[model samples]
Target: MRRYEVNIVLNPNLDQSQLALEKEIIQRALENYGARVEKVEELGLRRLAYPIAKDPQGYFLWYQVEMPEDRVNDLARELRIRDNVRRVMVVKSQEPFLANA
Candidate 1:
């Protein structure tokens, strides 16, 4: 498993219950690929740099996990079309450097 980060922007108007459901969908996809979710950050609603699908504000979510390299793309593809999710991006998370020489 390698470290990875997924940044998601969701429709801000969703209520709390709706938000939880959307997150569950995301987590389910990752877990299906054998990913171990290390941390999940909910950044809450924030203003976007520009409108996305006419939404000026969005709910932000960041997920940190370890997963197989080959599984990242599949997970991303599954989340792309998820309802209430305006954007989903998966990127390589940089590992910390060891200073013990």
Candidate 2:
């Protein structure tokens, strides 16, 4: 298994319920690919450094996960195909997982 940091940016227009549902969907997707989601951090809605898909802001979700290295590309591809997800990035992490730090 390899450690990775998954950063997901969701559309800013979603309401409260939609946000929760979207988050759940993402978590389920990770699990489906045998990824252990070690930590989840919601960065909330924030102005993007640069606009993406015409949106000036987005809801950011950060995830610390452990899964097979070979599965990373497939997982990223799955997330990129979702309409709710504006952007998805999975990068190998060398830092230790910190909870609420």
Candidate 3:
């Protein structure tokens, strides 16, 4: 199993409660993709370096999970089609070769 981190930037205009609930939506997608969630971290709202969809700020959420490397692409597509998601990035948590395997 490989560890991966998925960062999702949400539409900042939504209310705080809605922002929290967004986690459920994201987690469901990840689970459907066969990801085993390890941890979820909310980075909260922050100013974006560049504007996206006319918004200068975004709500950031991070998820640490263990899953097969091949599923990342499909999970990314799932997040992309969501209207509320402004951006989605999936990165491997650590370089497998770098570890003392």
Candidate 4:
């Protein structure tokens, strides 16, 4: 399985309910698309260096997952079109590769 570290930001105006729901939605979508979550780090709310869609605040969250190479595109495409997500980035994990001599 290929590994990836993905960070997705939530809408600044999301309520508690929406936050929970979106969290679930993202996890479910990832699983359904064949991603196995290995770790998740929630950085909570933070001020952005620059405003995004007129919002200067954002919720930071990261997920580490293992999945097929092609599955990355599926997750990225969905995140791109998701209305509740302010921004998202997917980075393939190279820890193991780099660790090898």
Q: Estimate, for each residue in 1-101, the C-alpha lDDT of model 2 and write its tens digit.
A: 67787777766776778767876686677786577778877675656555466445766666777788887888788778887766677777886687795
- True lDDT of residue 64, candidate 2: 74
How does model 4 fare in lDDT? Answer: 0.70
Task: List CA RMSD, all candidates.
Answer: 6.1, 6.5, 6.0, 5.4
lDDT tens string, model 1, 31-88? 7656777887766565665545644576666666777788777777766777655666
lDDT of 4 by residue, 35-76 (tens): 777787777665565545644577666667778778677768
Q: Which candidate, 2 or 3, would have the higher lDDT against the true structure?
A: 2
Report the C-alpha lDDT of model 3 over 1-101, residue by residue, as the tens digit: 77877777766776769867866776677677687777877665656655556445766666777777886788788787888776678776865566575
Stronger candidate by lDDT (3 vs 4): 3
* Predicted structure 4, TM vs. truth: 0.68
lDDT score for residue 86 of model 3: 65
Q: Where is model 1 more than 4 Å wrong at Cα?
A: 23-27, 47-56, 95-101
> All candidates' lDDT scores?
0.69, 0.72, 0.72, 0.70
Cα displacement (Å) at residue 62, model 2: 1.8
> In model 4, how large is the Cα lDDT of residue 13?
74
The numbered model that scores best in TM-score is: 2
- Which residue runs of candidate 4 sit more than 4 Å off their true CA positions? 47-56, 95-101
